[PDB]
C-alpha cells in the first residue's frame, strides 16, 4: 500500500508546526500563555443520567490552556479504544508506515472530512460517490477541480455492480500509473444517508472493499449517523474490514452527544491521519480543551456502558420520531408519494409523484400554507436539475406537527395534479 | 477595490453552503438538542457575575450555531472593532470593501483560512525575518516565494519595503504576469519571537507603499492587548481607506487559548470566502464557548474588558521588567536584546556563539534549564542561528534568575 499517491504536493510537505534532561526544568523555551490571567475559574455542568461534572480551579486553568494537536490523551485513549472495541480493525497493530490505525480528535467531523479532501484531491482527480448526496460534501469537492463521477445507488445505498462498469473504464494496472486517472477514493455515508435515509447492507460492503482493493482506491466512510441506527445488530463497518489500511472512517458525536461543542474524530492510517494532524496544526491547532474535557470526563463517568446505553436511548427516540413520520405519510401521501423507509439518521426522504420540480411547491405555495421541507435539488452534482424530491426532518416535530405537514404538502399535490 | 486577484479559482467557486409563521418546519438538518446529556452550566468569573446556563441556553450552546459566530458575540466584536479602530471602512458598500468579521475557531484559523485564499504557487509574498515558525510552517506548503524584508527595534524597516519594490512599478499591480506581491504578512506587536512593535510613522509609510502597489496587509495581532506603552499604536485597520487590510485579533492571551475563539476583520468579500471555506471545514467556533465569552463580554462591557487588558498588561509588564532585571544581572557584556514592546516574549543574541543549538539542546537542556533557539523562525531554519526565544509569562523571579545566571554560565564555558 503506496501512500504517496493519495498526498498532494502541498500536503506532503508539511512539516509539523506544534505546541511543544534533569528533573527539575525551568522553561523557558515554549508559548503559552500564562493561564491565571483568565477569568473563568470554575465550573459545574449538570448531566442527565450522570453524575455531574467539575472543573475545579486547577482543571478549569488546563481547559482554559492550549492542549495537543491531535486531542487531549484521555479522550484520544478513549475513542482509540472505543474503535478498538467497535470495529477491531484488521490494521491496529500494523507498522506505523504500513497503515497502522490511528485517531485525530477533530472540531466536528467534517472539520477532518476537509482536510481529508484537500490531502488527496488534485485538480481533474477523479472520485467515486452516490448520488443523492450530502449537501456540504457537494461544495466541498466542488472548488478542489475534481470530476465527480456517480454509482448508482438504491434503498441499500451503492449499488456494487454500477460501481463495477463504472470502474471497467480501467484496468486494474492503471493504479499503479498516476496517467490514467484512477479513482482516488470513494466518498459514501453508509447509514441513513442525508438525505436519502437508507443504509449500505453487509454483504454490499465487502464487495465495495474488493473493488476498492482491486482498483486500489482509499474508501471514504463518512458515518456521522453510526450511532442512530435503529436495527439492534449494527452492520459491520468499512473501518473493520480494512485489512490493507485503504479506508478513512469520520466519527460525529453531533447527533448523539452535542453539536455545538465542534468534536469529532478521524479514524485511519498514520501517514494519512498524520497530513490531517499537521494541516491542522497551521489552523485550528486542537479542538476546544474545554469541550474534549466535558465529553472526556462525561465518556469515562459512563463507560462504555453508560455511552452505549445512552445511544440506546437516542435511537429509541429517533425510532419512534421516525413511526410518526411514516404513520403520518403512510396517513396523507399513499399512492401520491413514494419513499423507503429510513434505516438510520433523521431524514426521510420522498418522491413526490407526477410533480417535476418540488421547489415550485415548496418555495412558493407550501410555505405560504405554513409548512416546509426541504427540495431534494442541492443534493446532487448538477443541483440545477429537476427534482421531485423532498427531505423530511423528523427529529423535532410532534406527531401532529407532522400530521398538517402531510396533510397540507399531500393538498398541494393534488391541487398541483 | 480589485479582489478577484486576491482570491484563487477554488476560493472563488465556492458556493454558499449553509414566514408568516405559527409555522411547522421539516427541512432543518438540526438534530433533536434534548437528546445531549448536558443539561446546565455555572461558570465562576473573577470580579465578575457567575456565568449560568439554564436549560434553554444550554440546549442552545450545545446546538449548531451560525458560522461566522453567534450574533451577540459578532455585534460586540464588530463593535469593539468599529470603537478601537473605527475604520475608514465600515460604511462602505459590500462590493467596495465594507468591514466585515466572522468569530473563527482561534485567530490562525482564520489566517490560514486567509493565505488559502490568496496563494498560488509561484505568488511572491512579504513578511520580515524573524517570523512566526507556525507562519513559516503554513505558508510553506502553499508554495510561495517568501521575500524577506528587514526588521529592527521597530519592526519592518520601510526602506527595505521601499528598495524590494522598487524592482517592479506600479503599474506592474494591474499585470499579474509580473507577480507583483499578494500581500505583506506582519506581527505589529512584540513579533513573536522578537517581541518588537512597529510605529505609527512606520505604519503610515508601509500603508503608502502598499496602495502604491496594490497589496494586502495581513496585519496578525495577537498581542495587540498585551502592550506595555499605555497609547496603543494605531493598527493598520485604523488607516485602511482601501479595503486592503486583513486582521487578526485573538482572545487567546487574554481570555482562553483553550476555548479556540479568535476574529477575523477584513473587506467583506474577502471575509466572505473565508466564512464559505469554514462551511465545510468547521462549521463554526463551538457555541457553547461563545456564549461563555459573549456574556462575559456583555456583564464587563466595553470598560470592564479593558479594565481586564490593563490588569494583564500589568502583569505581563512586571513579568518582562523581573526578565528584563534578570538579563541585566547575569547577561552583560555577553549577549544584546532590546526590551520586548509587547507580547511575552524576549529575544537574546548570544555574543561570540554561532549557533545556539548546542548551547541549549545539549549543554543547557543538562544543568535543568530550557530556551528556545531561533533556528525556527527563519524561512532558511537550517542557518545558524546566535538567537534565542525566551518567555517571561509564567516564570517566577527567582527561576528567571537561575535560568540566566545558568545560562550566562555556559555561555562563558561555551567561548
Ligand atoms: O445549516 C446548518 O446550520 C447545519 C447543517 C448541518 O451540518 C447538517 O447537515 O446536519
Given at each position: 500500500m503506496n501512500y504517496a499517491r493519495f498526498i498532494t504536493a502541498a500536503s506532503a510537505a508539511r512539516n509539523p508546526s506544534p505546541i511543544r534532561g534533569p528533573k527539575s526544568m525551568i522553561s523557558l523555551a515554549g508559548g503559552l500563555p500564562n493561564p491565571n490571567m483568565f477569568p473563568f475559574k470554575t465550573a459545574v455542568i449538570t448531566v442527565?443520567?450522570?453524575?455531574?461534572?467539575?472543573?475545579?480551579?486547577?482543571?478549569?486553568?488546563?481547559?482554559?490552556?492550549?492542549?495537543?494537536?491531535?486531542?487531549?490523551?484521555?479522550?484520544?485513549?478513549?475513542?482509540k479504544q472505543l474503535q478498538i472495541k467497535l470495529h477491531n480493525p484488521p490494521t491496529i497493530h500494523y507498522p506505523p508506515s504500513?497503515?497502522?490505525?490511528?485517531?485525530?480528535?477533530?472540531?466536528?467531523?467534517?472539520?477532518?472530512?476537509?482536510?481529508?479532501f484537500e490531502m488527496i484531491i488534485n485538480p481533474g482527480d477523479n472520485v467515486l460517490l452516490d448520488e443523492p448526496a450530502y449537501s456540504g460534501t457537494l461544495q466541498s469537492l466542488h472548488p478542489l477541480g475534481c470530476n465527480i463521477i456517480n454509482v448508482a445507488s438504491d434503498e441499500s445505498g451503492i449499488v456494487p455492480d454500477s460501481l463495477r462498469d463504472i470502474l471497467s473504464r480501467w484496468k486494474p494496472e492503471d493504479a499503479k500509473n498516476p496517467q490514467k486517472n484512477?479513482?482516488?477514493?470513494?466518498?459514501?455515508?453508509?447509514?441513513?444517508?442525508?438525505?436519502?435515509?437508507?443504509?449500505?447492507?453487509?454483504?454490499?460492503?465487502?464487495?465495495?472493499?474488493?473493488?476498492?482493493?482491486?482498483?486500489?482506491?482509499?474508501?471514504?466512510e463518512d458515518d456521522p449517523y453510526y450511532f442512530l441506527q435503529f436495527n439492534k445488530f449494527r452492520v459491520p463497518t468499512f473501518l473493520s474490514m480494512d485489512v490493507d489500511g485503504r479506508v478513512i472512517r469520520a466519527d460525529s458525536f453531533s447527533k448523539i452527544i452535542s453539536s455545538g461543542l465542534r468534536?469529532?474524530?478521524?479514524?485511519?492510517?498514520?501517514?494519512?491521519?498524520?497530513?490531517?494532524?499537521?494541516?491542522?496544526?497551521?489552523?485550528?491547532?486542537?479542538?476546544?480543551?474545554?469541550?474534549?474535557?466535558?465529553?472526556?470526563?462525561?465518556?469515562?463517568?459512563?463507560?462504555?456502558?453508560?455511552?452505549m446505553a445512552h445511544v440506546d436511548r437516542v435511537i429509541?427516540?429517533?425510532?419512534?420520531?421516525?413511526?410518526?413520520?411514516?404513520?403520518?405519510?403512510?396517513?396523507?401521501?399513499?399512492?401520491?408519494?413514494?419513499?423507503?423507509?429510513?434505516?438510520?439518521?433523521?431524514?426521510?426522504?420522498?418522491?413526490?409523484?407526477?410533480?417535476?420540480?418540488?421547489?415550485?411547491?415548496?418555495?412558493?405555495?407550501?410555505?405560504?400554507?405554513?409548512?416546509?421541507m426541504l427540495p431534494g435539488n442541492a443534493f446532487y452534482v448538477d443541483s440545477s436539475a429537476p427534482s421531485p424530491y423532498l427531505r423530511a426532518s423528523f427529529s423535532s416535530a410532534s406527531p401532529e406537527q407532522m400530521d398538517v405537514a402531510f396533510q397540507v404538502l399531500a393538498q398541494l399535490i393534488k391541487e398541483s395534479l
Open positions: 442527565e443520567n450522570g453524575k455531574t461534572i467539575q472543573f475545579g480551579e486547577e482543571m478549569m486553568k488546563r481547559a482554559l490552556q492550549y492542549s495537543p494537536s491531535a486531542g487531549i490523551p484521555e479522550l484520544l485513549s478513549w475513542l504500513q497503515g497502522q490505525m490511528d485517531l485525530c480528535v477533530t472540531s466536528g467531523s467534517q472539520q477532518g472530512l476537509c482536510k481529508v484512477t479513482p482516488k477514493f470513494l466518498y459514501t455515508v453508509p447509514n441513513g444517508n442525508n438525505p436519502t435515509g437508507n443504509s449500505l447492507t453487509s454483504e454490499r460492503k465487502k464487495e465495495i472493499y474488493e473493488l476498492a482493493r482491486k482498483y486500489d482506491f482509499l474508501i471514504i468534536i469529532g474524530f478521524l479514524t485511519g492510517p498514520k501517514p494519512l491521519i498524520e497530513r490531517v494532524i499537521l494541516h491542522i496544526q497551521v489552523s485550528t491547532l486542537h479542538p476546544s480543551t474545554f469541550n474534549q474535557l466535558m465529553i472526556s470526563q462525561l465518556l469515562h463517568e459512563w463507560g462504555e456502558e453508560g455511552f429509541d427516540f429517533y425510532s419512534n420520531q421516525k413511526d410518526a413520520i411514516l404513520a403520518a405519510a403512510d396517513k396523507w401521501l399513499t399512492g401520491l408519494a413514494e419513499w423507503h423507509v429510513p434505516a438510520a439518521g433523521m431524514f426521510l426522504w420522498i418522491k413526490v409523484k407526477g410533480i417535476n420540480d418540488v421547489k415550485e411547491l415548496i418555495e412558493e405555495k407550501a410555505v405560504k400554507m405554513g409548512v416546509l
